[PDB]
Design a protein around this ligand. Structure first.
Ligand SMILES: Cc1ncc(COP(=O)(O)O)c(CNC[C@H]2O[C@H](O[C@H]3[C@@H](O)[C@H](O[C@@H]4[C@@H](O)[C@H](N)C[C@H](N)[C@H]4O[C@H]4O[C@H](CN)[C@@H](O)[C@H](O)[C@H]4N)O[C@@H]3CO)[C@H](N)[C@@H](O)[C@@H]2O)c1O
Ligand SMILES: Cc1ncc(COP(=O)(O)O)c(CNC[C@H]2O[C@H](O[C@H]3[C@@H](O)[C@H](O[C@@H]4[C@@H](O)[C@H](N)C[C@H](N)[C@H]4O[C@H]4O[C@H](CN)[C@@H](O)[C@H](O)[C@H]4N)O[C@@H]3CO)[C@H](N)[C@@H](O)[C@@H]2O)c1O
Ligand SMILES: [Cl-]
Ligand SMILES: [Cl-]
Lengths: 409, 409
């Protein structure tokens, strides 16, 4: 309890952080010697696998000073910038030290460039107080942000006075929003004359070499991070020269640190091939097939949203959800509790076989829950809110919307 | 110009970033093969030396998976937190990904905890737009910050309604402010009952194992960064549980990235001994003794402020300033232009001997400037503003103070 922060991490039944000593590909070792298969993967930022040898080699060599210095420019700066520009498009690119920092800088730049005060937001954008909730729904917070919770009806309401709106800023979820949802969001923004920022810190580079919403949203400004460096401390923003001109004022001391550049250059090279993304989808799909069959065979009322790139357990009750993760912990399957599971490209045959076996045992442990009432919508909404910080897409009217917000805020 | 940002770095006569392809110790190699002795050292964040072997081996181990995982807690988290707490004091500690992020989080936490609106600031606190200049000098900016430019007369007036003030936040400079100045700041903050935040991102851990202002200011909250990881992308905040309770809300995806943790634990272990800070002070003092003697023997009107830990050339004219850095550049002495020079612990007997030879040659190249009018106060004020973003300490009244603000802002 020296730590002033509350980091999101794997925690035990007493809410104490699990202490991990080492990791390799899909596997972790804890301080008790217990061995785990990782579906958390630093919240999906470990796309390639823990201790990736090719990234590791690049990082080790950069640490010796052999690839340039934190004092100033190296050609790896140009490499990283060019790689991102090719994958994501736009006219310019900037680099940052976290997803939180990049999305804040992006949106403040757009607010400066447009001269308009309000940001309309769906999803999570990082830890900064600028994103804290307002006094009431549909009211701006103290930093001019209004949350629309992915409800396009609420967005239309807010877009009635678009002259106030610097940008719509959206964190995609491809488990809970359809392609059609995105095209409608795009349409609404375009017709309102408002800038669209795609916060792809989580989903960027993971579904494909580039932005997951490149065509669906064709955002004016993008942000990525988790996909770009196999976990290392870098994020990126890009888009029009005009909207991002205010980023000229960004400078920070560690900008040229060569280990982070080494990791991003290495990881981005593999990302560009599309191979790790395919591997993840395929491995995760294989795991899902099996897990869905095990749950059904055991009469357990747990749906799975999403797909192999990112999936989420949707249990019929809170009690079962807790039991599910307790059983998974007991069997050494480390899931990101309540949230999305994101396998890495290190999920090979060997790993998948073991994970399949362990999950069968998870389902045995849950035998007491067999035959429970099937999953209903309240559960779907609750569980989706945990991953997206807003409302999954499904038919509603305004009164149902209000009630869901009143419940879930 | 893919890059949307304008990073601070060594730049050539066309303002293009210098490309450095390698580094070891005190030495850089540029793209053309030229070897430079580095006094910039990533703005003083390279306290140990480029490619420090022990840091680099630690980073190499951590890159392989064998020393923690990005998915969660590791023993290095504890080690880093404990070491910071021992060196800097306070009740709790938080980690962040840049000095910019750390200072913003710290001052926002105090504002939240105190419930008071205004932050009274002196010095640079990073790139975030919360520190942008107010439209009217000495009035609050859009984020509630009033810059007082290190003038304690102005601070007195701003403290006349202390109930409005969340914190005074100050970036120390030990070249341009005396101990007595710090003691007066502490006395003023204490009499107003206001919280004092020491932004030691640059100076922390570099003058001593701990805070440069530990006794002088006895700050309620501290921030450090440049001293803690030999360049790697981490910073820290610490202070009272109360004031920093709002940091519970901080979480970021790369928190457990093992290479940065291993670098911090290694660098901090060295810092705790006091040895690198002593080496730096002694090596720098030896270089200054020599440079001062060379400038004087050449009748060049250049003073040097500061000491071995951080020093700054103060030329009599802007023309001579530009010539001085042109000359240094030609001799492969890489100074942080206009700002403070911070040698590293890798400045050994051989480096120093070669630096002295090169600097003597610099003075030879500046021969046309011999006999020039000696440095005056307008030059001292202009040059100090470049390094501290406010006013060097000297006797003034309010006429002279406001005159200087109008000139230098
Ligand atoms: C699109 C996007 N944009 C920007 C960023 C920021 O990038 P970064 O700075 O590099 O981390 C991210 C970073 N992503 C990390 C995670 O962000 C969310 O997770 C958030 C949030 O959803 C989740 O919120 C929790 C909520 O799900 C639970 N129902 C209730 C819990 N109290 C609450 O916890 C969080 O909010 C509390 C507010 N009081 C706070 O006290 C908690 O400590 C805080 N963790 O906590 C996470 C932050 O730590 C996503 N669910 C996840 O898929 C994702 O992996 C991102 O996904
Ligand atoms: C106490 C403290 N607190 C927090 C931080 C932030 O930590 P970080 O996020 O890890 O970098 C730092 C980081 N420190 C970096 C530097 O901060 C200052 O440097 C600033 C500022 O003084 C300096 O300002 C320049 C000024 O000295 C020149 N006379 C004029 C020039 N236009 C101006 O340029 C900079 O600020 C402009 C202000 N709008 C901006 O437009 C320019 O693009 C920017 N380069 O630019 C630097 C930004 O990188 C100090 N002089 C230096 O000793 C120090 O190394 C810190 O020292
Ligand atoms: Cl003063
Ligand atoms: Cl001058």
């Amino acid at each position: 309890s020296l730590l002033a922060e509350f980091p999101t991490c794997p925690r035990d039944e007493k809410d104490r952080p699990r202490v991990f000593t080492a990791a390799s590909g899909a596997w972790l070792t804890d301080e008790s010697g217990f061995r785990w298969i990782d579906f958390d993967n630093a919240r999906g930022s470990i796309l390639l696998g823990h201790g990736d040898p090719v990234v590791a080699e690049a990082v080790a060599r950069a640490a010796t000073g052999a690839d340039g210095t934190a004092t100033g420019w190296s050609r790896r700066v140009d490499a990283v910038l060019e790689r991102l520009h090719a994958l994501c498009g736009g006219e310019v690119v900037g680099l940052f030290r976290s997803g939180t920092a990049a999305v804040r800088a992006a949106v403040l730049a757009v607010r400066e460039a447009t001269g308009r005060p309000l940001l309309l937001s769906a999803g999570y954008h990082g830890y900064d107080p600028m994103w804290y909730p307002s006094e009431a729904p549909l009211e701006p917070n103290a930093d001019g942000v209004v949350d629309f919770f992915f409800d396009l009806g609420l967005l239309r309401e807010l877009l009635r006075a678009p002259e106030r709106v610097a940008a719509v800023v959206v964190s995609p979820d491809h488990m809970h929003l359809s392609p059609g949802w995105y095209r409608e969001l795009r349409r609404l923004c375009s017709a309102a004359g408002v800038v669209l920022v795609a916060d792809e810190v989580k989903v960027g580079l993971r579904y494909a070499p580039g932005l997951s919403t490149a065509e669906l949203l064709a955002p004016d400004v993008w942000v990525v991070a988790k996909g770009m460096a196999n976990g290392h401390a870098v994020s990126a923003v890009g888009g029009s020269r005009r909207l991002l001109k205010p980023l000229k004022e960004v400078s920070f001391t560690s900008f040229f640190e060569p280990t982070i550049l080494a990791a991003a250059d290495a990881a981005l090279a593999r990302v560009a091939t599309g191979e790790p993304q395919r591997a993840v989808r395929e491995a995760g799909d294989r795991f899902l097939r099996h897990a869905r069959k095990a749950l059904d065979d055991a009469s357990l009322p747990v749906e799975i949203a999403g797909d192999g790139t990112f999936f989420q357990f949707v249990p019929a009750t809170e009690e079962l959800e807790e039991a599910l993760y307790g059983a998974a912990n007991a069997e050494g399957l480390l899931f990101y509790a309540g949230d999305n599971q994101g396998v890495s490209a290190a999920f090979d045959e060997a790993v998948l076989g073991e994970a399949e076996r362990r999950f069968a045992r998870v389902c045995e442990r849950l035998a007491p829950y067999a035959g429970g009432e099937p999953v209903g919508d309240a559960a779907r909404y609750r569980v989706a809110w945990n991953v997206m910080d807003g409302l999954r897409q499904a038919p509603r009217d305004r009164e149902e919307t209000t009630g869901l917000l009143a419940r879930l805020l």
